[PDB]
Amino acid sequence: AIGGGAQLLLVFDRVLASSDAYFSLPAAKEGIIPGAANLRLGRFAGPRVSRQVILEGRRIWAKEPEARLLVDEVVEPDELDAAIERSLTRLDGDAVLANRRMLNLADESPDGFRAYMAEFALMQALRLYGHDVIDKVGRFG
Amino acid sequence: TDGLWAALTEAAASVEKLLATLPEHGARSSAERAEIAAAHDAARALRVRFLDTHADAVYDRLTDHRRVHLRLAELVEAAATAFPGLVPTQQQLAVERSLPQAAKEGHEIDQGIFLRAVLRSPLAGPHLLDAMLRPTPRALELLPEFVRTGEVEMEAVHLERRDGVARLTMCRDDRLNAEDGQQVDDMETAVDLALLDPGVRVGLLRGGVMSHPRYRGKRVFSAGINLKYLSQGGISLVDFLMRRELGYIHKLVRGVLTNDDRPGWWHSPRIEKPWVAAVDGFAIGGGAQLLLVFDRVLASSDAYFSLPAAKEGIIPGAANLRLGRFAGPRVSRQVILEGRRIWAKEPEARLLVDEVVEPDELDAAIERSLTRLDGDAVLANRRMLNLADESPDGFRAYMAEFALMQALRLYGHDVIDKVGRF
Amino acid sequence: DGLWAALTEAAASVEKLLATLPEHGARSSAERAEIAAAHDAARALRVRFLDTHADAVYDRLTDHRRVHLRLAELVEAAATAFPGLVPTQQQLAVERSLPQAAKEGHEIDQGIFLRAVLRSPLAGPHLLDAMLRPTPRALELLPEFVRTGEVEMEAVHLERRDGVARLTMCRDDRLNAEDGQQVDDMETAVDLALLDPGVRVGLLRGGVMSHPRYRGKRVFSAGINLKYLSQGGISLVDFLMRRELGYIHKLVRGVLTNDDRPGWWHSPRIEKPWVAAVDGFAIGGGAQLLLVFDRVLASSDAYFSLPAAKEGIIPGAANLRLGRFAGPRVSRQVILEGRRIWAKEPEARLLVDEVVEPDELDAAIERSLTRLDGDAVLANRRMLNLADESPDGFRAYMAEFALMQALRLYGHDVIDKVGRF
Amino acid sequence: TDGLWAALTEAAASVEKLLATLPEHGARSSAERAEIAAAHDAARALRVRFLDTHADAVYDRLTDHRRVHLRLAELVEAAATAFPGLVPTQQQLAVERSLPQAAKEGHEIDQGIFLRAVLRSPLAGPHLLDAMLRPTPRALELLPEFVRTGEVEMEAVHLERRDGVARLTMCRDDRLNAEDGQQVDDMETAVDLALLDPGVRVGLLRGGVMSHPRYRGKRVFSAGINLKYLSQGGISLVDFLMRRELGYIHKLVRGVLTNDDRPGWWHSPRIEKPWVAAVDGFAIGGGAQLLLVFDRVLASSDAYFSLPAAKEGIIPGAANLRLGRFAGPRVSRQVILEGRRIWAKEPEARLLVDEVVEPDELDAAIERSLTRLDGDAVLANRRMLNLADESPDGFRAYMAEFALMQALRLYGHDVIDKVGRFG
């Protein structure tokens, strides 16, 4: 899960990963802001790990200790499909719905989000036309 | 004298009469199968009882009372003509070899019975091991040219001297370095050259770039034994399974036993050196085993290690003897009894690996570690370390039982059955 | 020489001294010292005599290592062929009828005897193989077990099912506290499991407890019965030594059978993989058990300990095996300092393979059983056990153990502590 | 009947003659230094062949068929005069000891060969090992006063009996407790006293407060062998490297072998007791080696442990035999083969240290750990534990090879070289 894909994980109620997978926000030196990751990663890994991942492109492997800051279950490719089906049945009731609503309200307030997206709107625009990014993007083949 | 030799002879003859009159392996009925099976068992049981009290006499007759060193191959061949019926003759072996495992009579087992008895002897045992620790005729022959050009090239390995480092690269690019009789021959030759060449101070083992489509341009350490060959009858109990353990692998640990030529021989009859292993992709089976004898192991962030054949495979060489020391009795069994695969990035990787590096900083981590093991201190300390971790008796006792246990596994129905599915 | 003559006298000197002297616990300080010095002189000669004749003393009892004799038959036969060397059934009956605090400690002589025997590169191996042979009681029960698949015993319930030998420790009233009868049942059960062709894998687990404090819940083992030990009911030979050389060694090396089947030439012993499932806790001899299984599961709320760091006896063969599992530091924390290890802490994985919430346990245990079925597991397990523990190591340790434990079994500090449970 | 002795006797003389005609070491020519070199080798190679078949015979002659117990020093000296040429003579060594390491002839190497062959013998080896396990005369001499006084000040060790504890404080306040011959003798004398004293139930080894300006006011466990003394040729292969391993260090494990006096001797011929070690500042080399032997080990949070001479040092004592048991093959080679240093506060420090406590709460933790090792259960259990961790054969076998290997390293140009740069 890289970039936009890795950003997506900071939003899920449950996250499974294959033992050989990794997660990263790679463009530490000449990329655009990694979506809402800058607003959410801290909540998941703390200030230090957030800056290692986003400021210095640190890549995190599924099987290392800190992967549990982002992934709930790391399973062998052979037993992966079964684990997914199993996790899908544990989130059915109304308790889950009520609780995740209260949890999300606490983790990310309406103001926290609106405020962030506001600045992001202009910051991400300027980066979208940054010579360094335009430059880096042209070399991808 | 005690009638044991007469009995065996009598038992071996009933076995030959049945193989001569009975229909081929696939066309035998239940009764016929039960009968040749009982015959094979009677003969083998007597091979055990005979050598149980005669092993030394027999061994002594083949090595002029332990005065001549004979490698595995020569030992079992000399024993075949000196004691017809004790172990398979070169010819019987040919017939066996020309057939797929499922149709073999399992004559190699008799060699496994032989080798076990020879290794259980506190006299014959050590002597045979020293034999395997001496340089191979092939290595001795290629030494001068290697010492000159600093490069050799074999069918499965590529040896190159450079800055005092012997560089062994396993290059079976089309089969993830699957092992076989030739790979073993090339590995031991290469290890001898590295140990005899005065310009080499440290060795290095690493898998080369693959050509196969699913691995194009990617390095791979080892996929273990060649399962196709094993299914086809091409994996030799003696020339492969036993040879690797007593040959090159045991040389990575104790060095090569030379002649009383060089100086200091009185306090170091063997020439040994430190070794570094670097794992790319993964180290499976036979290859994961190799890691249990290196001085330093480096691995790629994305590599994994395993001894997979938990349910229908053969014994993973000397791993059962060595894994406990590294990971303890629980992890060892989780790995061997249940095929638990260990990833380079999990905490327990540090039980088998010294360094795990991202694939973009690995070549430099390897080079840098090749300079940390140069001195004489390392040589002395390594010798003492291996002496404490693995005593001659412990290693000898293990291999002794291994010779027979592995022989039986090489012919187990389940093994033959799974390997046929690869 | 004349060591025998000397011993016979030192013994006589003791035997007559006990007839005139008043009953133990009624003796004066000067009296206790006299009988003490007498035993000491007697026992010193026992060691001196066996240090040079153990092999001959053994060759006579076993017809030159031609007849296998289990522990009980050996010491009994020794008692009659060499009066004074070891206690007669008679001398021992008097002892067994007294609480530990009042025994003369005659078992110590048996400790002296078994140590010399086990120390011999000739007799020790022969005695070990004797203990590895199947118990006569198991042979008797084998046909009925092969047919019924069930055997209810006093301390264990055995049931064959889906190729699994299910042994259940069921002393529901005392948290499976060990005693002589439990050892007989355990060995009988292990022997049956290994001899039945219908069994492929074995499983050891504790059953539901009836005691009010644990009613409805399973409990693996609370160790040796401390009450009986105080009472003088724990036998050095029949309990302490029998379990180590008997069923526990068979869990590792299987049972030595007769040359009566094919393949015996490469496998004289029949071994099989074992799984242990720990509910509640495993203390003492129970935790000791764990260091011998191929697979160990435990419920998330369990713990492991060898508590008597203070005033206890040697925790069996844990001193021999724990180092291998935990290293020398943790090993000494558990046995010298009594550190208890919980199932959910990191280091519990040094002893347990799998820890599961009690409502997921049965499923996990079943799954574990089916993974150890094949012939590959058999070969691998045999080679691993061979590398993890050599014949000499186990033998040398069990040799000194025989005596060291004998001595601890009669130490004032142990007797006192045991009397307070 | 064999002639090897004769061949040896010649080669030995063939060397003496040359060392007689040839000049002083250093003032020799390339051709000379190689003429004497091939002389020693030829002779030492014969000492090996000779002992490889006559060792038991040569040993039985010096000890009246293993009926007399002789410590290392006595042994190697009794064999010198009884077997001229097999090993250095007393004064032949006083000369060596008066030359700095880089100039010595390497005569000790002959003792290396001797001891190796003696410990390789299943009969002689155990006998010698027992001789070293017996109390030293110096200890037996001071036992009574210690019992009365409870105190003894030695040159490198302060010993004090307090609350059932033998408190041993390594007190070389000026050199960070660097080790030497006297230190070994003092440690063995102290360890002997602790074991013989009936008022001692548990022993303790700690480093005292230092005085050197760079550590004034702070405790330090050990900085290993004295490199200066080593460079200066004052580190005896026998009376230091071998003595410490077979004497006090082996005694910390197996205790002292007494005579058939006290009762219960028939079941416990040796007197052993549990030992606790508290590490202040750091434990390096010989000091770190020591930790692999203790029943309990405490360390200050700011301390570290290491066997630093990965590239040009001598074998770190018995560490090569024991570290694996504690940290596994991989960590052992990282520590010993590559000088990896381990800090008290990192996860793997628990492979060597039981308790890491803050300097402010350290003293209290030590006193607390000293009370948990008193009973008979502990004594019985540690005896069984030590028998399982390190068999008599494992140890004898290791010390045998170590004897010759450590000798060769003791005269290795790379080590002699490194040692001379320490300042």
Ligand SMILES: CC(C)(COP(=O)(O)OP(=O)(O)OC[C@H]1O[C@@H](n2cnc3c(N)ncnc32)[C@H](O)[C@@H]1OP(=O)(O)O)[C@@H](O)C(=O)NCCC(=O)NCCNC(=O)Cc1cc(O)cc(O)c1
């Ligand atoms: C490694 C793999 C997972 C790779 O998966 P993929 O990415 O799916 O690659 P694949 O397409 O399967 O294989 C790539 C390529 O390599 C070939 N390959 C891969 N593994 C092997 C082996 N083991 N042998 C031969 N050829 C092999 C494979 O056949 C492919 O070519 P094609 O057959 O023509 O397609 C797979 O190849 C595999 O599962 N191999 C099984 C590995 C294995 O189980 N080895 C068994 C090890 N067992 C021992 O070493 C036993 C042993 C060895 C000893 O040395 C000593 C001893 O005492 C005991």
Ligand SMILES: CC(C)(COP(=O)(O)OP(=O)(O)OC[C@H]1O[C@@H](n2cnc3c(N)ncnc32)[C@H](O)[C@@H]1OP(=O)(O)O)[C@@H](O)C(=O)NCCC(=O)NCCNC(=O)Cc1cc(O)cc(O)c1
């Ligand atoms: C397990 C416990 C902590 C349980 O605490 P609780 O929940 O407080 O239950 P309790 O009320 O105490 O006990 C429940 C019940 O079981 C009985 N019980 C519990 N443990 C025991 C033991 N060990 N023996 C007998 N009965 C016992 C207890 O007496 C109660 O019945 P009542 O007395 O009538 O009330 C407690 O019972 C306990 O501390 N037992 C001590 C456990 C112990 O120390 N065992 C010592 C082990 N030492 C060895 O195994 C030594 C050994 C054994 C060997 O097999 C070999 C060898 O070489 C060496």
Ligand SMILES: CC(C)(COP(=O)(O)OP(=O)(O)OC[C@H]1O[C@@H](n2cnc3c(N)ncnc32)[C@H](O)[C@@H]1OP(=O)(O)O)[C@@H](O)C(=O)NCCC(=O)NCCNC(=O)Cc1cc(O)cc(O)c1
């Ligand atoms: C400990 C140190 C890191 C301290 O650094 P600092 O804070 O920088 O203090 P320093 O200024 O260097 O030293 C303080 C003080 O102690 C002295 N000191 C420190 N270490 C030593 C040693 N090893 N020897 C002598 N004197 C020493 C040092 O010379 C200083 O006094 P001055 O020389 O007059 O200035 C440093 O002293 C050092 O690196 N010592 C090297 C430690 C070492 O490598 N010891 C080698 C151990 N190797 C063995 O034990 C081998 C061995 C021992 C055995 O016992 C048995 C066996 O079989 C094998």
